[PDB]
C-alpha cells in the first residue's frame, strides 16, 4: 500500500509455477506484485547507500599565481631558463620576443623569454570511486494490510538490505511469513565505471572515462597539503603584448563551466552518507512462504461505513477507506463488485485479502473496478455498503498506455527490461537474447550521440528506408529510424 499514488507503479499480476516472480526495481518506480493467494505487496527500492569511498584524481576548478618571474636573453644566445623552471609548482612557457638596441644587446632579432609562475589550487573537486564491496541497497516491502495510516505512507514497511555480498535476504513480514527475495545487484548500474565527483556540497555520478577525459589539473588525491598538479597549464594563459613582453593570467574559476559540463549526469545527495537516489536492480523474489493472514477469519455481518470519499489512483484502481461497525476484532471483509443494473463478478481486488484487525481502527481497501459503470459491495448482509462508481477508460487506451510504459522501461533498462515481470517463459528468453544483441550493437554505434543528433540520424535513416528499393534494407532502415526517433525523444532524462 506504500506504492499507491506513486505515479510510476506498474503491477505484476502473474506469479510463476515455481512461485518466484522476477521484478526490476527502480528508485522512482514501484512494483505491486500480486498472486492467486499470496498477500499482495508493493516492493519499492529506497536508496543505494554507498560508503567507504576512496577519493582519487582531485581536480582544480580554480587557481592562484602568487610569484611570477621573467628572464629573457638575446638572439642567438639560446633559450632563457629560470631557476624556478625545475620546480614542481611553477607553470611556464617559452616565447620569442624581438630585441635589439635600446633593449639590452647589440644583435637584432628575436630573443627567448620565459615567465614562470607558481600555482596554487584554492577550490578543488575530487572524484570518488565507489567501493563495490561497501555498496548497499535498501528495499522496502510494504504489504497491503489495510492499515489506516498506510494508504500512501513512505515510512511503513520492512526494509531488506542487499549488497553484492549476500544478495539473498528473506525479509520477515510481520504476520505474512517470509518473502525470500533473490536479487542480482551486479547487473544494476555498472558502478565500476562511475565515480562520484563532488563540488562542495553537491555530488554526481559521471562516467569514469569522461571524468578522466575532462581537462583540468589533477593530482593523486592523497590528502596532502600543497600537492603537485599535473597538467596545470590549463588554468593559466600566457599572452603576448604584441611582441614586447609576456604576462601570466590565472583564468578564473571553472566552477560554472563544470556545472555546465555535467549537464546530463544524474545527481547524488552527499549529505550524510553518499546516498545515490538514481538507479535500479533486478529482483527475483520468491513468494513460496508467504501466508495470507485472515485466510481462516470468518465473514462479518455488521455493516460498513466509509470515512472519506472514494478516490481514484492514476492507474485507474479505486481505493476505499472504510470503518467496521461490528464487535468482531478479527474479520474478513466480504467484497463483491456488481455490474451496472445487473449481477456479475467482473472487478478484481488489488488488495489480496481485506481484514479488520481492530474495530477501533479502519481498513484501507483498494480495488480495480471494471471499465464503465460498476457497483461495489462491502458488507455481506442486506445492509451492505453500496459504492457506486464509474471508470472513465477504454481498454484499447489501457493497452496503448501499457505499451507506452513498456517502451519507456525498455528505453532505460535495455537488456534487462525483458525481466521486469518474467514468469520464466522461453519466449521471454529469446526476446531478451535478441534485444541484448541488438542493444549491444546499437549502443556500440550511438554512444555519445546527443538527443538532437539522435533525432536527426533517426529521421535520416527513416528517409533512407522510405527511398530504398531493396526491401530488406528498407525495412531495416525504417525500424532502426523509428527506434532512434523514440530513443532521441526519450533519452534525455
Amino acid at each position: 500500500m506504500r506504492c499507491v499514488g506513486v505515479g510510476n507503479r506498474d503491477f505484476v499480476e502473474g506469479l510463476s509455477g515455481a512461485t518466484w516472480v522476477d521484478v526490476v526495481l527502480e528508485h522512482g518506480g514501484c512494483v505491486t506484485t500480486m498472486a492467486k493467494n499470496k498477500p499482495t505487496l508493493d516492493i519499492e527500492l529506497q536508496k543505494t547507500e554507498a560508503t567507504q569511498l576512496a577519493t582519487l584524481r582531485k581536480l582544480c576548478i580554480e587557481g592562484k599565481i602568487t610569484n611570477v618571474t621573467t628572464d629573457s636573453r638575446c638572439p642567438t644566445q639560446g633559450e632563457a631558463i629560470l631557476p624556478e623552471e625545475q620546480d614542481q609548482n611553477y607553470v611556464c612557457k617559452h616565447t620569442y620576443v624581438d630585441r635589439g638596441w635600446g633593449n639590452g644587446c647589440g644583435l637584432f632579432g628575436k630573443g627567448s623569454l620565459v615567465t614562470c609562475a607558481k600555482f596554487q589550487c584554492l577550490e578543488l573537486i575530487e572524484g570518488k570511486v565507489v567501493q563495490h564491496e561497501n555498496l548497499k541497497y535498501t528495499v522496502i516491502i510494504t504489504v497491503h494490510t489495510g492499515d489506516q495510516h498506510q494508504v500512501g505512507n513512505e515510512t511503513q514497511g520492512v526494509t531488506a538490505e542487499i549488497t553484492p555480498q549476500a544478495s539473498t535476504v528473506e525479509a520477515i513480514l510481520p504476520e505474512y511469513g517470509t518473502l525470500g527475495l533473490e536479487c542480482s545487484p551486479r547487473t544494476g548500474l555498472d558502478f565500476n565505471e562511475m565515480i562520484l565527483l563532488t563540488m562542495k556540497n553537491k555530488a554526481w555520478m559521471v562516467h569514469r572515462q569522461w571524468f578522466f577525459d575532462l581537462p583540468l589539473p589533477w593530482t593523486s588525491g592523497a590528502t596532502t597539503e600543497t600537492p603537485t598538479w599535473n597538467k596545470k597549464e590549463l588554468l593559466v594563459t600566457f599572452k603576448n603584448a604584441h611582441a614586447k613582453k609576456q604576462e601570466v593570467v590565472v583564468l578564473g574559476s571553472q566552477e560554472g563551466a563544470m556545472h555546465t559540463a555535467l549537464t546530463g549526469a544524474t545527481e547524488i545527495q552527499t549529505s550524510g552518507g553518499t546516498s545515490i537516489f538514481a538507479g535500479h536492480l533486478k529482483c527475483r523474489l520468491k513468494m513460496d512462504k508467504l501466508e495470507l493472514k485472515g485466510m481462516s477469519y470468518a465473514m462479518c455481518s455488521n455493516a460498513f461505513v466509509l470515512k472519506k470519499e472514494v478516490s481514484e489512483t492514476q492507474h485507474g484502481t479505486i481505493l476505499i477507506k472504510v470503518e467496521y461497525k461490528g464487535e468482531d476484532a478479527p474479520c474478513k471483509i466480504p467484497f463483491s463488485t456488481e455490474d451496472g443494473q445487473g449481477k456479475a463478478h467482473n472487478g478484481r481486488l488489488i488488495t489480496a485479502n481485506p481484514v479488520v484487525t481492530k474495530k477501533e481502527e479502519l481498513v484501507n481497501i483498494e480495488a480495480e473496478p471494471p471499465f464503465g459503470e460498476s457497483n461495489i459491495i462491502i458488507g455481506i448482509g442486506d445492509k451492505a455498503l453500496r459504492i457506486n462508481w464509474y471508470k472513465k477508460g477504454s481498454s484499447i487506451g489501457k493497452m496503448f498506455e501499457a505499451t507506452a510504459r513498456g517502451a519507456r522501461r525498455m528505453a532505460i533498462l535495455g537488456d534487462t527490461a525483458w525481466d521486469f515481470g518474467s514468469v520464466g517463459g522461453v519466449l521471454n528468453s529469446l526476446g531478451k537474447m535478441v534485444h541484448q544483441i541488438f542493444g549491444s550493437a546499437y549502443t556500440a554505434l550511438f554512444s555519445g550521440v546527443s538527443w538532437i543528433m539522435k533525432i536527426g540520424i533517426g529521421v535520416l535513416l527513416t528517409w533512407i528506408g522510405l527511398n530504398s528499393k531493396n526491401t530488406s534494407m528498407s525495412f531495416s532502415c525504417i525500424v532502426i529510424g523509428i527506434i532512434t526517433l523514440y530513443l532521441g525523444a526519450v533519452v534525455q532524462a
Partner: antibody
Amino acid sequence: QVQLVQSGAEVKKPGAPVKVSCEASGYTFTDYFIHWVRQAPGQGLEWMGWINPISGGTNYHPRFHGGVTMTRDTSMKVAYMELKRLTSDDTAVYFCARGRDFRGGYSQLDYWGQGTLVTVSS
Amino acid sequence: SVLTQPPSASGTPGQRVTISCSGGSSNIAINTVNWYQQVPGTAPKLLMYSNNQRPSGVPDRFSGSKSGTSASLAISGLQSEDEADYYCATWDDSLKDVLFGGGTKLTVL
C-alpha cells in the same frame, strides 16, 4: 601596519537611514573583503554581508538583503555601508572585518574594526 | 543548517576545556572552521586563522580540530586571560553565507 577604523559611534531615531563607514589602509584594498559583521548588545555575533572591493559585488545575508546596502568606493579605500530604514530592533555594533578571497578565506576575519555602535530610540 | 555551541566554563586550574560546534553536512563538513575570541567591550580576535592553526600567540591553551560534522577547541591548561566570548565561523555553501556560532561565555573560575 594594517588596520580598520570605523566612522564613530552614531545615534538615530527609528525610521531614519544611517551610513556607517569603515576606513581601510596599509594594504591592497582590492585584494580582500569587508565582512561587515554585526553584534547586538549582549547577544551572539551575527555576520550580515561582505563586498568585494575589486569589483563591487555584494553578498548580503538573506535576512539583511534589501534592508541594507554596501558600497566599496575604492578611490578613498573606504567601505561604506547604509541602512535603508533603521528600526528600533536593529540596535547593535557594526564591525568591519577583512577576509580572504578564496573559499578557505571566506569565513576567516582578521583586523576587525572597533565597531560603530548605533543606538535607536525615540 | 545552523551550527550551534553551548556556553561553558571551567576553573582556573586548566584541567580541560571542550568547546564544540556541531554544524550540518554543508557548512562544517566541507569548509575549514575558524575560531574567534571576543573579550567583552572589544572587537573579536581571530583565534584560529584556519582549521587547527593559530595566527599568533597563546599556544597549547588554544588548539582546535574538526572531525566530520563537528569542530572543537581543545586545551592543555587554561589561564585567567582565557575568559572571553568564543565564536566558530564557517562558510556555508547551501546557504552560501558565513555562519557564526550562537555564542559561549567561557569564564575562568
